[PDB]
Tab-separated table of C-alpha atoms in Angstrom:
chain	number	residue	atom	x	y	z
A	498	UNK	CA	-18.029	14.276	-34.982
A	499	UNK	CA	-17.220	12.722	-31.635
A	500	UNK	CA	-15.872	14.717	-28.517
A	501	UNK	CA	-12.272	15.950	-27.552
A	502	UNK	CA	-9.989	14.087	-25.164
A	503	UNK	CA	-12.277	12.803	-22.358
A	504	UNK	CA	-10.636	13.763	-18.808
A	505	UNK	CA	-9.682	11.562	-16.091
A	506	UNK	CA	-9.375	10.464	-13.036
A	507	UNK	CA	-6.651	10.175	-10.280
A	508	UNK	CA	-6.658	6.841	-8.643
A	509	UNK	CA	-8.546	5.437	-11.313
A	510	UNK	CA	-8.582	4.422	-15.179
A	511	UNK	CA	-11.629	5.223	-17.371
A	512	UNK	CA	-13.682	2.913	-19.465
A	513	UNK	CA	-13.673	4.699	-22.955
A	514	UNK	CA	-15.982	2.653	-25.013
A	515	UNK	CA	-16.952	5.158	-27.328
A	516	UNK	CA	-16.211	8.639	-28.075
A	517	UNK	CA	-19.003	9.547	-30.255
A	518	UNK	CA	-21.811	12.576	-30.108
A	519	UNK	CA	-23.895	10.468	-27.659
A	520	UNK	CA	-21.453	7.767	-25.980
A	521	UNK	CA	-20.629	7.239	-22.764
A	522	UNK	CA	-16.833	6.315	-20.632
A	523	UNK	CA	-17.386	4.418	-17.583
A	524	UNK	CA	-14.696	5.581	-14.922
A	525	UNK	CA	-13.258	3.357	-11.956
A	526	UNK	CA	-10.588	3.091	-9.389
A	527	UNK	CA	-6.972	2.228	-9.611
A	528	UNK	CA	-6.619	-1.254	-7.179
A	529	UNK	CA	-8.107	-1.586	-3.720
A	530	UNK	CA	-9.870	1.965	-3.861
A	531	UNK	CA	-13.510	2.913	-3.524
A	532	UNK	CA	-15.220	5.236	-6.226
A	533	UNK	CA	-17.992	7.697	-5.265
A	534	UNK	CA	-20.402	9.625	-6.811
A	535	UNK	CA	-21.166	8.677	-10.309
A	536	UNK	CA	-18.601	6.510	-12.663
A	537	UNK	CA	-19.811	7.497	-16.425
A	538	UNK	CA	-19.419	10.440	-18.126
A	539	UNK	CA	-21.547	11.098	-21.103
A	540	UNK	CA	-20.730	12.530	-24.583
A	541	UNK	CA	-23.069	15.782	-24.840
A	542	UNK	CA	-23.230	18.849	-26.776
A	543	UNK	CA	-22.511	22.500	-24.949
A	544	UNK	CA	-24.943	25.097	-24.535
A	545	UNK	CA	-23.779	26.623	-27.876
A	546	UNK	CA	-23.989	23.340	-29.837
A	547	UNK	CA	-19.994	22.308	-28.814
A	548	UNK	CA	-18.141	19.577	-27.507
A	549	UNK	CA	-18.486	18.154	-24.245
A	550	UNK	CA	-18.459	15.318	-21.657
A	551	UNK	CA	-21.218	14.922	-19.302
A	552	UNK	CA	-19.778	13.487	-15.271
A	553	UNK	CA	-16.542	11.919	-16.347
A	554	UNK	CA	-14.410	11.793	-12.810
A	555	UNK	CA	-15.919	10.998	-9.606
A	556	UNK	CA	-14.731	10.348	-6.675
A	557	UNK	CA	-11.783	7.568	-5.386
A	558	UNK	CA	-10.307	6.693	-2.062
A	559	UNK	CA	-8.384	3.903	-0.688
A	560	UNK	CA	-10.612	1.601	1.229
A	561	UNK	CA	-10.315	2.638	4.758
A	562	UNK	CA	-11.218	-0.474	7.036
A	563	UNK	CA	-11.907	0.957	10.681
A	564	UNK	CA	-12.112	-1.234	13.560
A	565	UNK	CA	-12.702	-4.676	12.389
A	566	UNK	CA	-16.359	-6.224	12.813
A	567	UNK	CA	-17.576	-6.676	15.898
A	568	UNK	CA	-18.642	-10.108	16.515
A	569	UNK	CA	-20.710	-11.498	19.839
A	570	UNK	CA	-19.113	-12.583	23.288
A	571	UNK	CA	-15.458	-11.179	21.564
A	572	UNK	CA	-13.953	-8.294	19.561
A	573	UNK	CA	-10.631	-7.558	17.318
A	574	UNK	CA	-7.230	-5.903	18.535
A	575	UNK	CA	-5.696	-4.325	15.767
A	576	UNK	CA	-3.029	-1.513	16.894
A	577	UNK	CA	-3.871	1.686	14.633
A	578	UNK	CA	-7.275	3.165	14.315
A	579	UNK	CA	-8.355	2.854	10.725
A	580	UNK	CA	-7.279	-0.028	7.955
A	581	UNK	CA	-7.008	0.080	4.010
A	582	UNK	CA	-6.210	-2.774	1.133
A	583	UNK	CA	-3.434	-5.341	3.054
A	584	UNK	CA	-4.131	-5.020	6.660
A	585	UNK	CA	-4.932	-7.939	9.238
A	586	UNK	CA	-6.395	-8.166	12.526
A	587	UNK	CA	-6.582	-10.639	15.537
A	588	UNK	CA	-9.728	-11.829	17.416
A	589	UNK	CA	-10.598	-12.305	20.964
A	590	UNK	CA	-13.339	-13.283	22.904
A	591	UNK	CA	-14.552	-10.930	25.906
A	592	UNK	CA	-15.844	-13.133	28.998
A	593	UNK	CA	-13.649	-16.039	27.667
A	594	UNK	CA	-15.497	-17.825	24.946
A	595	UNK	CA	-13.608	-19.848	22.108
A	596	UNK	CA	-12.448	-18.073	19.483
A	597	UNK	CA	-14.009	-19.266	16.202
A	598	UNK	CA	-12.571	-19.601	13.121
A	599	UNK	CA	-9.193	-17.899	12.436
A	600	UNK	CA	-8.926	-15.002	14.827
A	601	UNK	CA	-7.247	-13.296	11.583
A	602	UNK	CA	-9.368	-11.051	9.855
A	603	UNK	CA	-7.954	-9.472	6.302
A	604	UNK	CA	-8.963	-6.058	5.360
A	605	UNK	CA	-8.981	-5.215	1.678
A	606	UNK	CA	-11.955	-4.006	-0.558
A	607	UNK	CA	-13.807	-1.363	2.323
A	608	UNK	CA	-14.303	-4.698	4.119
A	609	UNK	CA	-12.959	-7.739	6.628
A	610	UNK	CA	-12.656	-11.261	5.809
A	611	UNK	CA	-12.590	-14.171	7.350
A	612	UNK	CA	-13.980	-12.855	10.358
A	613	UNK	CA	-13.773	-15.326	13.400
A	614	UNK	CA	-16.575	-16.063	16.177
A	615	UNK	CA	-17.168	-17.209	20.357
A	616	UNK	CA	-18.252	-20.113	21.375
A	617	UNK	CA	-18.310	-22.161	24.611
């Protein structure tokens, strides 16, 4: 019964709650990565009644933040072109509003936070 050693994944652990003719491993990322594609592979049988395991590893990236959010009457400086898990970014206004907020903005997740705004 059951299937052979599941694979894995690279930048990523899998979820192996089951190993039986029928179960199913869910597969993730490592820590601040993205996965694509599918996450679960599924515990078949082959074409000639074997072992196998339906879409185990997808696909994983670090989360690459480009240019921070682009908020009204301002934008972000940043110095490099792209952004992953641990990067930060300062605010600015454009005609001269007020910066709102904390001109910081961190980038971790595929995503800014604590994104700032302009106001007179």
């Amino acid at each position: 019964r059951r299937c052979p050693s599941p694979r894995d994944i690279d930048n990523g652990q899998l979820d192996i709650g089951g190993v039986d003719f029928g179960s199913s491993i869910t597969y993730s990322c490592n820590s601040g990565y993205h996965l694509i594609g599918e996450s679960k592979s599924y515990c078949e049988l082959g074409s000639t009644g074997s072992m196998v395991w339906n879409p185990e590893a997808p696909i994983c990236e670090s989360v690459k933040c480009q240019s921070p959010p682009s908020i009204s009457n301002g934008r972000h400086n940043g110095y490099e072109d792209f952004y992953t898990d641990g990067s930060v970014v300062t605010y600015s206004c454009n005609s001269g509003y007020s910066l709102i907020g904390n001109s910081g903005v961190l980038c971790s997740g595929g995503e800014w936070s604590d994104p700032p705004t302009c106001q007179i």
